[PDB]
Design a protein around this ligand. Structure first.
Ligand SMILES: [Fe+3]
Length: 186
């Protein structure tokens, strides 16, 4: 029985129920994420920005089933084109807008990665991706508004691949946390 999360804490409690088992009902998880109405006071603790690039701020470890993190995107900050390491990725906007650009997996042949589509993800909207769907890039293209997003990865992963848009070549990247549970983690 899916109920509207009243607060971020309530959302987290609900997520623990939805990930209690070994599989993932993607549509239910996405629906509850989209039903949480972003309340900045509830997530201010995690919203730690860096001047030069986007930051990853761990919120909850999902009893081992998922990582829930808040990403803070300064103006013009964006990601690589990347995969999600055989995990589910849910991305909910908490503040601002993000451009999501979709790419297919490259062939072995070195070639330009041509975008398959793009969309603007707006406040409170929740997107979903996995490796079976493809790759994406996420960017805050705003010149005037920082963006904040809530990401759920299941299972948790700490590495992924970045893809060179010019060639399709991939490189392994280890993700780092800017903070965990509100505590800056150099
Ligand atoms: Fe992603």
């Amino acid at each position: 029985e899916l109920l509207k999360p009243r607060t971020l804490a309530d959302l987290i409690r609900i997520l623990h129920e939805l990930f209690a088992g070994d599989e993932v009902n993607v549509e239910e998880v996405q629906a509850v994420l989209e039903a949480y109405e972003s309340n900045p006071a509830e997530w201010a603790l995690y919203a730690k920005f860096d001047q030069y690039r986007y930051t990853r701020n761990l919120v909850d470890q999902g009893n081992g089933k998922f990582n829930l993190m808040i990403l803070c995107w300064g103006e013009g900050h964006g990601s690589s084109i990347h995969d999600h390491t055989d995990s589910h990725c849910f991305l909910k906007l908490l503040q601002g807008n993000l451009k999501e650009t979709l790419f297919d997996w490259p062939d072995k042949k070195s070639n330009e990665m041509i975008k398959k589509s793009e969309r603007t993800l707006r406040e409170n909207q929740c997107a979903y991706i996995n490796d079976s769907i493809g790759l994406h890039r996420v960017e805050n293209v705003s010149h005037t508004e920082p963006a904040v997003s809530l990401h759920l990865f299941s299972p948790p992963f700490d590495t992924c691949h970045a893809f060179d848009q010019r060639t399709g070549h991939k490189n392994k990247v280890t993700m780092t946390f800017h903070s965990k549970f509100g505590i800056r983690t150099p």
